[model samples]
Every structure is written in C-alpha cells, then in structure tokens.
Target chain A: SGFRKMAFPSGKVEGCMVQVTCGTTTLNGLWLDDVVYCPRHVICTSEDMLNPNYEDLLIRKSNHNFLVQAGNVQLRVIGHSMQNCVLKLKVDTANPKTPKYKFVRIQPGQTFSVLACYNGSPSGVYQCAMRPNFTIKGSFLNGSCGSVGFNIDYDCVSFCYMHHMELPTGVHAGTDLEGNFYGPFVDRQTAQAAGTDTTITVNVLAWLYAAVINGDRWFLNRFTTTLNDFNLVAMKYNYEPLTQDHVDILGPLSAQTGIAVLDMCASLKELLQNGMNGRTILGSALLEDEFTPFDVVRQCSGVT
Target chain B: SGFRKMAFPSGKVEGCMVQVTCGTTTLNGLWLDDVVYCPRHVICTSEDMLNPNYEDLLIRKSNHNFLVQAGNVQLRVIGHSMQNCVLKLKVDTANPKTPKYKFVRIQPGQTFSVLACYNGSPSGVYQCAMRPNFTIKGSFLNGSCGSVGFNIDYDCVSFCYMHHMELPTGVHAGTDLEGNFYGPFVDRQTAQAAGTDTTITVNVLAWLYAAVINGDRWFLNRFTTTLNDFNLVAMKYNYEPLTQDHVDILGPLSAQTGIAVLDMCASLKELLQNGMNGRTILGSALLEDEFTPFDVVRQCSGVT
Candidate 1:
C-alpha cells in the first residue's frame, strides 16, 4: 500500500538530470520505479536529502566525479556507514578529468550528484561530491538509488540522444585511450568534424527543447547561452529559430566543418521529430558513456 | 469517433501561456475546449498559423498593445479584412502608455502578442500584432479566435497572482486619472508602492513559477534576471534560492518596501501552494486590466 506507481509517459521524463531542491522523499531517485528518475548528476539539495533513514537512497558509485562541487571541495554520495552517522557527500572535475576523494561540507543551495557505473558498488551516498579521480571503466548512469535500472537494450532511458549529433556519413563516436567517451559538441556542420564527438554535447539541442516542454528552469542557467546562439550566425539559423524553407533558401552541408551552419534546419527537424526527451534520430541509439567492443570495432576501421 | 479527449493532470497544462512553435493546429488557442486553451497573448509564429482558411482564431480586440514588437511601424489585428487582403497586426507599448495603430513587417524570430481584455470584438485575426491606441472599454481575452470565454470570475486565466505583489496592507492596487489599471509591482516591497500596484505585477511571482513547471523557456529570456536574483541579497533570499526556513530566520515583512527581500520566501511558498498556473494566493482573484466599483470603493476609503 505504501508503494505508489508511476509510469512516465513516453517523452515525460527525460534524463536522470532533473534538478530538484529535495522537497519530498518521493521526488528523489528512491522512487526509482524503473529508471531512477533522480540522476546521479549534480542536484541542488537540502540536508534532509542525505538522511539514510529513508531507504530511498542507497549508493554512490566510486570514481565518478563530484556529487556536489563547493568550497574548494567536491562531495560524493556515500552509502550509509554501518557504525558511523553523519551527512555530506563531498567528492569531486573539469576537463573531464578525475581527482582523489574526500569528505567536504556543503551549504544549502549548492549543487551536487554521483552517477552509478556498472563496475561500482553502492554506498549510502545520498548526495555529495568529492575530488574527481578515476579510470572508471564501465558504463555509468548519473547515479543509482533505490532501484536504478541498467537495461541493456535502449540508450539513455529507453531512448537515445543523437538528434543534434549526426556526424558526417563517415564519422562515428569513439572512446579515448583514457576510457573517456565523446560525441558531437557543436553542430557537426559548424565545428565540421573538428569538435563533433565531445561528451556532454550529445543531442544537447534536444535538452534545450526539453526546457521549454517540461519547464525545467534549473537547467536553464547552464544551457541558455547555447540556445541564444541558435539564431546568431547569418547562415546558421538564418536569424530565425528553425525552418526548412531557410534550408531551401540556403543549401547543403559543406564538407568544411569550418563553414557556417548548413544543416541547422535539418538538425532541428530531427531533434523535434525525435521528441523533446531525446529519442533516437538517426541510425543506431548511442550512449555517451556506455560502449561495447562493437563501438570500438565499428571505429577500428576507417569509420570517421 | 465523435470525440476523443485529453485532460492535463495537475502539474500538467500549466497556464494557457505555453509557447509552442505552431507545429499543429491542436496546439493553438482554438481548441477552446475551455478557456480557449489558446491565449490571445503573443505567440511566436509561422505563416501557416494565420490561414483565414482555419477556423482556429476568431478576432482582434481593437485596442491593446503590440502583438509583435517589430520594424519601422506597429500593426493591429483587424477583423478578417473581408473587404480586402492582408497579414499583419503590429502594435506598441512602453511607460505603460499606448501608441496608435499601423502596419509593417516582422521577422520570423520577432515576438508578438495580444492579451484578451474584458472588452472587445473579434475579427478572425490570428497570431498577429499591431500598433497600439485606445481608450477602449469592456474586458477581453488575448485575441478571441475560437470560443474565448470572458467570465466575471477569477484573475488572469482563472487564478490570481498576488503573492509577490502583496501591499503594505495599506496601499492596495489602484487606478490612475488616466482610467488605466495598475497593480503591485517590483514587489509591493520594492520601489515600494511607488511602483507597486503596477499593471503587470498582480502576482507576477506566480507567473515565474509557471516557467519551471510548464517548462516555458520562451518566457525565459524575459524573466531570467528576476529569477537569478532569487538568492542575491544578504537578507533577501539569504544567498539561498528560497526557504522559510529563510522566512522564519528573516522575521516579518517590514514597512520598508525598499528592502531587498523581507518576504521572498513567504511569497514563493504561496506561489508553490497555489500551483504553477497561478491559483489564488490572497483574498481574491484580481485581474490586471479588469476592475470593478468594488476595487474603486475598496481603495477609495484609504485602504492600501
């Protein structure tokens, strides 16, 4: 009787990345019915969110960067200690590099998170950040709590985020020697292939559309800049937001990544058609962090 | 099938203010299932939206503000120019004053709107802007394209927005010698009442809350500055976004409206409880443009 059922309609919930202020226990990842809605990603929080008494939160995957970055320290969500009692998940980031971990106090109104990886075990790490450090080898979702699902079928939550990230017919996403994954940063047509495969940039355009649909303002501060630039360049967005007529007025994508946007309209159309929550747009559904040798082999040859 | 229907659950279907890119007709204000669903308010658009061919939109209130703020001249939405042909409704506003009507060009990215007041007539002017000018009478709803209802009930769209504009309890909203309407602004607390009771301030705070719930980023660029200040002042939000936690610590509202934010937290609480679409937070629903002798008499007797 205590359990409440929730079936997020298609396009309802996006990523585990919904930023919340920790108002009710039900809102956190603990209610993770299927996919832990609470992302292991940084969440703006309150101290009560750390209470292990709830059974709502369970672990903090070791090695993933900061749960909450603050005061010269980052926190990591740690599992409840058997013999000890306390609050805080300080762990630690940037350049996508990792650092050593530690305990650090954070003030309210601060941001924090801890993503779960396939190889890591859980700690009562409710919410906190620590220094960034790791050679985290395995697939990881933002963070795991209650029942974070790791289904192998689809990409990020029964869908994928590759609409705005279509690479030239030649290129594909790849992993670095350091084990870091990457996807397109700027529109493939803009950065050309230059900065195409960058992490955090995958289908980012879809995320912006999410803000308008779900009204997730917390994520606004971080993404507003890129959105405003949508119609900035002349040929890019054609001073208008998005339209195929402009595409007709303009032309095709140049092989030159150095040129202004030639595929913005196409990219936008694909993003919208994929639905706001970032469904698959092009070929295969791609996960930014999780990959198999298939991905490696796909790129092993000359698959740009 | 005679009819298929949908009901937007609670936090769903916030205000009629959703910003859609005009993907399909169902998304426009015409669905008038109730409240017309489509706001006479300005909407970003595409030409297909204005097709006289569609029975979606109905009329243009003769005198209000600009529908779209654009080039060289302002335009007003006129009834279907049954006698001629056209596509424009440019209008204007500033200092709360109005300007005469005229016609001109508007770019695709340009912003446009027409708020429905209590008084007005309709003429099949859909998603168009125009020049401002009028001492017009009666109430109206943005632009009554479909079956725009004008009830003598609640404030904007059926709820009130008085949380952020609470008065000193002494200086209630009032009308000017110009016969124009006004409400609390800049926080009954800021600019004090000097600017409080301003036209748009009636529960302005409630509108901001809608952005997060409904994910209406279209309104984002317009209100972000006010949101960032949420944690600004030392005493205001206490460097934190909001809490009573902050309110309790901050004590009560001072007579000094000049203070950064003595009641910021309280205001936010009311807004949250009232629901994002702007339900009543105070005594009763107060329309920004529609007022009665009750409002006049209430304020006449030295009631602030």
Candidate 2:
C-alpha cells in the first residue's frame, strides 16, 4: 500500500495497487489505501483496469477461487542475512589515478587494500543493485586524501516490483493508427478476433540477470532513480530506452489469467528451450503459461 | 602492521603499518606487522621510504616534533551516523526501460519505485566512495523480471589512502635524459639544486573533490578498483594512467620537510590563484608548501 496518504516524489512513482471487484468500481483516477476486492465469481477482468493512474497499484495473490485482483504491491522480506556479493571492478580512472575506493563487493572473513594514483578530481561514485537475498555494508578507508580506499560486506533482504502487460496479433495488421482507449480489451479482442497478449516482462527480468554473473548495470525503478544521473556519470550523451515483448503460450491454458513472481534479485535462471516436457517451452509446454516460469515466444530489441 | 600479520589478499591489501626507530632499520627487505619507529633524531626519511613494498603501513598521530615516518595507515572511523550521502541518479536504461532501482542513496523516511523494460540482463552494481562522512545501503526491487528496480539509503564510517610525490625544476638549460635512483634526494638536489621537489600529492587530493559536485569518475585505487573496472563499464577500450607532481616550495622555509593531508573523501577544495599576497601562489605565497592547503606550483595533466 505504498504511501496511500502521500504524494509521489515528483521525480518518479513507486508502488502499485490493484484490486478486484465483482463488477467494477469508480476508483480509477483516484486512490488512497488500496482498491477493494471482488467477492463474487464474475468480476472485472484485466481488460477492465486500464487507467494510467493505475500504474502505481498492482501485485497478484491468486486463488483458483480468486479473480479481479488489482493494485501493484511489493513484498519487503526484511530481516535476512545478506548474501555474498561478488563484484569485478575495473579501474576507470585514466591518467595514473587508481580507484581509491574499490571495495565494491565483500566476503565475510576478508580485508581489502586499495591504491590510488597521483591526480584526478572528483572520484567516481558507483551505485548498483545486487541479487535480492542480501544486505550490504560498505565503509571507506579514511586517509588524508579523498577516501583512499574502502571495505564492504553485504548480506540479503526483500523489496519487489510488478507490472501488467498486453499484446495483440494481427487480423493480419495495418497502418500506424494508434491512440487513446475507448473500449475494454475484451470488447476490442472480441471485435478483432486474432488474440491479445501480455506477460513477457517477467521473463525478460528473469533471463537477463541469469546471464550476467553479477549485476553490471542498474535496472531503474519508478521512484527517485532517473536516467539523467546515469548519463551524467556513464557518458556524455543521453541513452534512448529499448523494450521487447513476450506473449501467451502456456500449454492448454488458453484463456486462463496468469501472474508471475520474481526474486526482485540478481537470482534469475533458466532459459526457454531449456528442456522438453517442461523444456517444451522445448516441449511446447511453455510460453504464455500463467506465471509457470517457462518463458519462450518472445521478441528481441536493442539500444546504443 | 598491515601484513606483518600475513600476506596481502591475493587481490588487495587491507591495512598498513609504518614504524620509525631514530635510525635506519633492516626491516626494508621484508616485514611482518610493521617497520620500526625511531628513538634517535636521524632515521630514514620520506625519500628513504620509497621502496615499493613499503606502500603498505602508515598514519600520522605524528608528534609535531616527530619525523622519520614510514608506511601508510588509514583510520577505520567506523560507528557513526554515516553522514547523509547524497547521490543524484539518472536513468541509463534505453529504449523504453527505466532503471529498476534508483536506491543509489537513501534517507530514513523513504521507499523507492523501480521500473524495468521488456529486456536486458544483469543490472548494474554501483560501487563508489561517499564524502567520507556517511554509509550507503542499496536494495533492489525484485519483480518477476530482473530486479525491476531497487531501494537504497546509507550512513557513515572510515577508510583511507596515501601517496608520496617528488618534483624537479629547470635552469636556463635543456637536456633530455632521465631514469633510475642512485643517491639520496639530498645528494642530487645539493649537486645541481635549484630545487628537487616533492609533496604536491596531498594538495591534489584536497582540491579535486572540492570541485566535482560528487565523484564523477572513480579515482582508481591501486588494487581492485583498477582502470579495467572503470574502463569495463565506462567504456570499451583501455585507459592509460596520468600523473603530475607538486614539490618543495613550502614558504620561506625552503629546504624544510613537508607533508600534506586529504579527506580520501569526495570532499576536496581550494584552487590556485584563488586569492593573493597569500593569493600570489597569488602573492607568490603559495605553491610548494610541505603540507599546507595552499597548492600551486603544481603542473596540469590529462587522460581521455
């Protein structure tokens, strides 16, 4: 229920709140605590919740018996020992200076020695997310010069995010004619016939980190963190964002709604075509399953 | 005493222990806990401490009347309020992606929102030194996808680094020949002496950070925080190291010894010609001070 009584940071928005009602509620453009739930069998469908303001609320707690869920909510599993974070640091300081504070990751029983070079102004400031499941303690080597060195050790903990997506195939296809929303996805899908899709956002997060041993870049969140800060440090120019999509293919689960969960961590694993029966994502048992973890049938994109 | 205790971490060393004994000590070739300190008036000196292995132990609780210091030691300044480290985050995600975690820095009363794009792997790990007055706590927004984002806030503590410098001036003559070490600095300077300088190492630290709003680039420390890390993330190729020197000009006190101080923090300031009389570095009162804040007479250099 991310601060239902306060305003957004003016910089970015965090927290999502979703609710399910038997029919529908006028609680679209406005919200305080959270959206209410649906007590009956027939309730609002995902297609019925399309308010842009609704982005702030969502998470799913599905009960084969439950439907019409709404609002984006994240879990905070606080009180856990931090995990061992491994970082491979490269010296970026050109000219002779060394990274005075290269204590990026830490192990339990260890100490680090850091060396700095002769000159260079404004040492660099690095900030990155680690696989969930740990907490971090980073300290500096307070020498007479700017932090001559540093030592850091971290453990683990909670924090999560969620999203709702939708896709559509062609009656074949058409020209660039898009804007506004006049009807429910149900209405449009019925009228068009092909099929509407969503949910690849989950796989992307999962598969990506599975590939990088440790986090190498930060995944931006809705609040506080922004792109300008990255551009300010990583380069002289602005980076345009890129996105791709994956859609439904869950075996025999045609119209069933799906929900997926993640570590909100650097702990993602498994790739599509990983195996049959299940590998059918090799077994053709994958893609589109409602939060089943098997992901396939996705697209690829890029950025510079 | 850094390693008089044992061997340095295969990756980096964590502590330093310098000692003095009033006279030369045979401990140069090897060390266990530290080099000895002096009881006599004449012992080894700054120049004498130049042996590469000697880079490890030192710190100055120095007696105003004390000299013959060796090795480098930084304080642990642990247990404190972790001064509020302020960080400005800019999103670096491209093509529709938002940084999943903007928790680069945090406060007591805050929660963060992080967003993810359709794809991308391994989030970024930001490793940096704070202004020496605080600590940092970074957590991520784990969603079904890669950490959809993150949350972070931190407090304070200690850590440090040290360096030594030497410089040389010219007469109205010109020749291109340099290399090796044969005699004491006293021997060389006394021979062709206009002045063989040393000690700008400290001022560079003092003035650099005072300039950047916050660290923009890491001042690559010797061990892990090497150029490769900076280059690995900040760019594609390798960067060469650059160094400039500042030496002996510590006032009418020419020929006396000098030592400088720094924050080893993001905190650094004061520039040359900042004022005069005294401002003469403005008044010619600057440049070449042993450990004074006044840093002029230093040369400029670059990298990139």
Candidate 3:
C-alpha cells in the first residue's frame, strides 16, 4: 500500500503553481510550472521538446521581464519603476548579511528575472532592492525603499525558519505601510472585544510567531509591557487586573513556541489549558511540519 | 557639626507655625498656651474680654450660646448630657459625598477647654461628633452616626480620589478626654487583634496621629482586608483558625512597647524573613518617626 506505482503518468503544473495527485489525494506547492515533468524517471516534456507550447523557446540575452518557472523555483521583479534596481540572488550562509549571490544589474526598461538556482540546487533567497544612494517616492515606486527579504526553502535546511516564508506578508512577516511591525497586537482589550476562542488563538499565534522569529527575550519584554498596559486598562475599565499566575502560564508557552507548529484553526485555549501533551504536540509539529500545531493541540486535548 | 545661625532680624512670621534653625538642628510646630493672638503679631491674653477666667470673652445676642473665645479660631465646646459620646471631625470635597474631617458636637452645659496652639502651629487636627441624625438619648449614645470628614492636606484641588476622612465613628485619629490619640484607640480590638505587616504599619501610625490625616486607603483596604480581623489577643489566649503565617512575632514586640518607642518598633517576623537591610541606627533612642522602613525592619530582625 505504501509504494504503488501508477502505469500512466499523472500530474501537471501551470505557471509558477503546481498540483499532483496520488489516487484520491492532492498535494500543492509542488512540481515545475508550464512544463510536463515526471519526477519518478526524471523525465520532462519541456526538456525533451515534446511539448509544443515551449517548442520555440530559443533563448538569447533576456530583453524583457520573465519568470524562471521551474519545480520549486520561481523568481521575478514585478515593479516597473524598479527597472534599474539591483536583483541579488543569494544563498543562506552562516551569516545572512554576507550571502553568496550573482551580481546582476538590470538594464533600463528591462525587468529583473532569473532562475533561483545555486550550483544546481534551488536553495536561497531573492533580494531585490535599490542601491544605497537611490531614493524613490510613492507607494508603487517605493519598491526599493526597503529591502524585500524572504527565504525559499527548497531543501528545508532549517525548516522552522524557512517555513515562515510561506506565511502571508503582513500576516506573519514584515512591517506595514506606516513602518509599524505587522500587528493589530493583541492585549486584553482586543481579547475581550473579540470574545471568541478562535480570535484568542489567532492573537496567541501572532505572539508566538513573533517570538519564534525574534527570540524569547523580546517576547518576554513585550509580554511584560502588555501585561502592565493591560493592568492600567483593566483599572480604567473596572476589570480585575491579570494576576501573576496568568502570566506564569504564558511564560512557559513562549519558550515552547520556538518548536511548536501551531494550527491556525483550532481551539487553542482548550489545547493549551487542558493537558501536558499540548506542549509535546506543539513541539512535535515543528519537528515534522507534517501536522499543524492545531492538529497536535486537538489530539492532545482529545477534541474531535 | 551642629548649630549655626542667620544674621539679625532676617526672619519673618507668616503664621504661628514658623520653623527656625541653629547649625544642624531646626524646629517648627511649637507651643503657645493662654493666648488670643493673631499670627499678624497682635496679641490678647485670652479674649477681647469675657468670663474673668473667660469673662471679657463675649456677649452676643444669645446668652448660653456665645463664642467660647476670641481669635477667629474658637477652641472649646463642652457638654453635660454626653459624657461617653465620641467626637469625630471630617473634611469635604468634589464628591461632597466624600471629604476628610473630625465630628463631635456639644450637649447642654459642660465647658470645653484646650490650648489654641501646639508649639504655635495651626496644623494639629481637631475632631467633633454628633448623634446618628442627631438623636439617641445618652449613656448608650452609640451613634449609628453619619461620620464627619476632613483632609489633612488643605487646598482641596486633589479631592475625590482621597476623602477617606468620612470613616466610621470610633475609628482612629484625634484625642479622647485624656488627650491621647494612642491608647484609647489601641484597645478597641483592632490594634492588638488583627495584625498584619500592612496593618501593623497602620495601627502604629494611627496611634501616632489621625486616621483621617493618614489616608485609610493604606489601612482599611490593605489591613483590615488582610487580617480580616486577625486577633493577637485571641491567638495568645488560644483562638480558632490561626493563619500559618500569623504567629505571635508581634507578641514579644507588643510587650516591649514601654521601652521600644513602637512608633519605631514593628514587624519582627517579616524583618527576619526578608533580608539583611532591615536594621539601621535611628539615633540613640528609637523614636518611631526617626527610622525608615528598613531601619525598623532591620532592628526588629536583630541583625546587629
């Protein structure tokens, strides 16, 4: 049952997106787009010139913007004002500031595009930004105002860290238009107003996501400030102040977040509050990345 | 290192409560008795003239109800029918609903006499009281009385938040017939009975001065609630439910009050439990007010 091979090939890709089927199951974020490729035998119609759509794909000096669409590899600069911007293709290293990259300066009117491969391996980040002296104005023209730093985990060298790249920009990474860190930061006020277990889960997850990427020190400071602010607000609102025990519970969880692959959709309150395995399951989720943090939380909590 | 002086006539009087100093020492709020004088430097023996002992004192339209003495500050009011009635005064503020003051009113005939000034300072507190709504025939005149209010700090700009002066009758602060704010107040079951670190600080200070002036927020909400009526007398004499933390550390200190200058001596157990900084030299004798919080604690801790 584990290793059954199908007689006919089954799978397809469209643009930079991909889809595959194994009997009744489907997997996403896989395969090379715009190519009929087969992984089992390492065969591909695009490389064999068996597909007519890519038949005239004779290459030359790239004069226009194009996407390097291939299995788990996609790179392109979308802004028009960023024509002269530098597109640095880099690989992860011991130090992120000094990454290995192909130095490519786009010519006037030609957009930046490149296949994100380093020595035959698709493993790194695509950084597109303006030079230090260049300054551009306007929301659309501000492409290079700040560097867009994101990771692509082709090999999952450090899975927990790179998995963050799959998250939505403001949802888990980067700042907003006003330069504020991504947050509708949750405190007691918002917690009370939202008044639902799911909302609490989202807020807690946001805090955990921030802690994981930033470090426990930052999270503890932020949590302490939030609790102090919450106390002031609670006094104004005539609500009871949060006690030390309330904070002690969150302290242990902050340490656990670095390894917990949280499920975005689950009763996080019950999971976290009810059992010992909650921390265990959260810990396991990050190690495997096969189950969401919520999956473990639910199973540990014995929720159907 | 002590005793110095300022040159000729350089000092002036703003009021009776003026402070003067020598090299390293100073004094204020001193004494003056048997005078009907204005701080503006005008002096009269007692009145503009009333009963020889008080004669040239007054003769208003009413015979029995006349101003007791001269100087816009009238001192005494005595009575015949109310020997055991408690006197209390309180203040009033924004929430006229609250203020701090003493309350006590005179009945039929006895005469009230008191020094108009304490070492010349108008700052000492005064208290007066009345029946619940002005009733209760005598002896058992335990007034279900509406308490009076007053602030130790005048200039009522900062009100409502304070105004704890409207406390229940028989509460601490002010003097009894013996002219003492200490003893009569201490025996009321509160001082020895329900002692806590916070409560000890309270009764100690209350015995030191007025309950109204000190602010009950530090005591009522903190102390009574903490001890919830813990009794030293009951504990020493055998009582039900002795809280584990509440043993008789104060028991030895209570007996040592004669030589200890308690306004200085307090908290033996907490002093020993917390740490070494509890004691410090506060002069040859421990005047309660001379030592800081740690000094009292350290001495009580026996840290030498």
Identify the candidate with maximal lDDT. 1
User: What digit string (tens of lDDT, one per residue) describes model 1 on residues B1-304?
Assistant: 0000011111111112211112222112211121122222122233532333322332432333223211222223232111111112222222121112222232111112222211121111111111011111111122222212111111122211101112332222211111112322221123343321112121133222222222222222212223334444312322224333423322222111222232332344333334224222111122112222122121112121
Sort the predicted structures by DockQ, highest score first.
2, 1, 3
| C-alpha lDDT score of every prediction, in listed order | 0.22, 0.19, 0.21
Candidate 3 on B24-69: residue-level lDDT in tens?
2222211122211111001112232121211122221122231222
Error of 1 at B194 (Å): 23
lDDT tens readout by residue for model 3, A6-27: 0000000011222222222222
TM-score of every candidate's chain A: 0.20, 0.17, 0.18
Which candidate leads in TM-score? 1
Q: Choose 1 or 3, whichever is better by TM-score.
A: 1
What's the true lDDT of residue B146 in model 2?
18
Model 2: per-residue Cα lDDT over B36-135, one tens digit each: 1111112235464343222122222223222222233222111111011100111121212111111123221112222111112211221211111111
Quality of candidate 1 docking, DockQ: 0.01
- Mark the regions of model 3 whose C-alpha exceeds 4 Å error after superposition: A1-304, B1-65, B70-267, B270-304
How far is A289's C-alpha from truth in model 3 (Å)?
Answer: 76
* Deviation from native of the Cα of residue B45 in model 1, angstroms: 14
For residue B92, what is the lDDT in candidate 2? 21
lDDT of 1: 0.22
Worst 10 residues of 2 chain A by lDDT: A1-10
